Amino acid sequence: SMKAASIIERLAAGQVHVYPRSRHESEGTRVQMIKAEGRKYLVAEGSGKLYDELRGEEADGVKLCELSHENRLVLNRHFPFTVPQAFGKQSATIGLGDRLGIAGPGHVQTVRGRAIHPILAQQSIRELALTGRDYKQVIDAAAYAVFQEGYTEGYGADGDHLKKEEDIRMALDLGFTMLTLDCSEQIDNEAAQAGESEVKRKYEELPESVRSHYEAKYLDKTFQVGPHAIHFDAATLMRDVLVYREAIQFMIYIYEKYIQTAGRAVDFEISIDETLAPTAPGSHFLVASELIGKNVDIFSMAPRFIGEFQKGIDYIGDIAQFERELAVHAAIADRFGYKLSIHSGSDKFSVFALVGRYTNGRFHVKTAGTNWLEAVRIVAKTNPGLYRRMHQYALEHFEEATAYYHVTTNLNNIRPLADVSDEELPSYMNENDARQLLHITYGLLLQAKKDDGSSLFRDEFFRTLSEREEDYEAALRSHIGKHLDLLGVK
């Protein structure tokens, strides 16, 4: 491996890019981050246990290190601000998911100087599967990004929408500080739609003790939440119990088995927006009441708001009605102490002001695929040839991906590639349908291979992004800054 030698030649010469906010020190060892263009490495001068413990090939006083998992574990031991940490429910957080592992620095640059704590490490099991990555890689990218930008005020790591215990225990063992319980397998959607009297049928099949609990505690009682009162008729109480009861036992069993016993602060987010019905406020209140009655420490709750929260696009539905429902949801979270969490929050610009107002800035908003879409925007401005090939590839495999994400995409709205010049290509990522076409097809585009073996687009994509890194980063700052401004952050 000759290059390690020359790179150091190129280094102390001074024609090599060093990230200016990346110099840190531990005892006698100084550490820096450099780009020997095309690639990123760690460089360590000095002498001390951090130099010795980093792995990489040396030359006199200098060691060149790849951004590996194990070098990340070493930096963790010497540099605390590179370890994920939890933030608690009296805070403002934003989940900045990165399907590529290259969005970190742009993300840090956006939250620098804003009153928000970033969850830089956030991926779901599906996203991992559709991209061929493990959770170690997700934390590695986030940790290396805060070291690159010298951002010491902290970041978190979120296991998004976990449903299986093996994945729960795995996320904890790897140091995840935030866990989002999915709870879909246990939500009884059948009961959420079923008509009345079928709800009474099934309700009265419930143990006497259970009905005596929920009825002695809720039936024909009214609860003050803020200025809003919530009253439980017999009809809604019975539907609620049937929709959520098994999901509530699951939340309690997960919390007691894995969260209470973790022996370190963990931010526990419960997701219940994977119900075909919106989450009524009485539903929300009862769930919370049951959890908080058994002393569970919730970080946030994600309800299903009225209307539609689809990937890629702004809100669909009646904004005044969403406002009425938001006002009560925010008030329920206030009574019980946790935050409201907004899934599929990205590009939902119509609701950000409302969310900032009614939660008085105390919220969680999750983004992800937007970030991949901003990368796709860069490919369309600087490598039109590459974008055309993917856009067409996306179009041909679009039916496949709608199994995984629920979109009402209208392909008839996407102008045909033949009818748009190269210069117009970027504008596709302003359009609802084209944005959704490339959002949900990321997994298919990332894994596609030439019929010999090598990647069909993935290597060219990352090569393009690496060389246009200054524009991607500036695209992220502009796109994500717009979210935070609309949220009213800082």
DSSP 6-34: HHHHHHHHT-SEE-TT--EEETTEEEEEE
Angle of helix 104-111 versus helix 135-149 axis, rounded to 10: 50
Angle of helix 432-439 versus helix 384-396 axis, rounded to 10: 80
Tell me which DSSP letter residue 449 carries.
B
> Taking phi first (over 0 means left), then psi (-120 to 50 degrees means alpha), and beta for anything else, what does residue 307 get?
left
**The token pair that represents 246 in the structure block:** 């098994």
Angle at the Cα of 458 from the Cα atoms of 457 and 460, rounded to 5 degrees: 70
Cα gap 373→311, rounded to integer Å: 11
- The rounded Cα 126 to chain-centroid distance in angstroms is 12
Are the C-beta atoms of 234 and 204 separated by less than 8 Å? Answer: no
- The rounded Cα 480 to chain-centroid distance in angstroms is 13
Cα gap 248→7, rounded to integer Å: 57
Tell me which DSSP letter residue 259 carries.
I
Tell me which DSSP letter residue 257 carries.
I
User: 479 labelled as ligand-binding?
Assistant: no
Distances (CA, A) of 326 to 140, 244, 285: 36, 20, 13
For residue 26, the cross-strand partners are: 29
Half-sphere exposure of 307 (CA within 13 A, CB side): 21
Residue type, 8: I
Cα gap 174→72, rounded to integer Å: 12
Cα gap 426→412, rounded to integer Å: 19
Nearest to 251 by CA among 181, 336, 341: 181
User: 343 labelled as ligand-binding?
Assistant: yes
Half-sphere exposure of 175 (CA within 13 A, CB side): 19
Are the C-beta atoms of 381 and 425 separated by less than 8 Å? Answer: yes
Residues with catalytic roles = 160, 269
For residue 484, the cross-strand partners are: none
User: 197 labelled as ligand-binding?
Assistant: no
H/E stretch holding 475: helix 469-487
Cα gap 385→422, rounded to integer Å: 8
H/E stretch holding 451: none
User: 273 labelled as ligand-binding?
Assistant: yes
478 Cβ contact partners less than 8 Å away, ≥ 6 residues apart? none
127 Cβ contact partners less than 8 Å away, ≥ 6 residues apart? 97, 99, 160, 368, 443
What dihedral angle (degrees, nearest 10) is formed by the CA atoms of 326, 330, 333, 339? 100
User: 161 labelled as ligand-binding?
Assistant: yes
Are the C-beta atoms of 247 and 301 separated by less than 8 Å? Answer: no
74 Cβ contact partners less than 8 Å away, ≥ 6 residues apart? 50, 53, 54, 55
Tell me which DSSP letter residue 52 carries.
H
HEC readout, 352-408 = HHHHHHHCCCCEEEEECHHHHHHHHHHHHHHCHHHHHHHHHHHHHCHHHHCCCCCCC
Cβ count near 53 (within 10 Å): 17
User: 158 labelled as ligand-binding?
Assistant: no
- Give the resolution in Å: 2.5
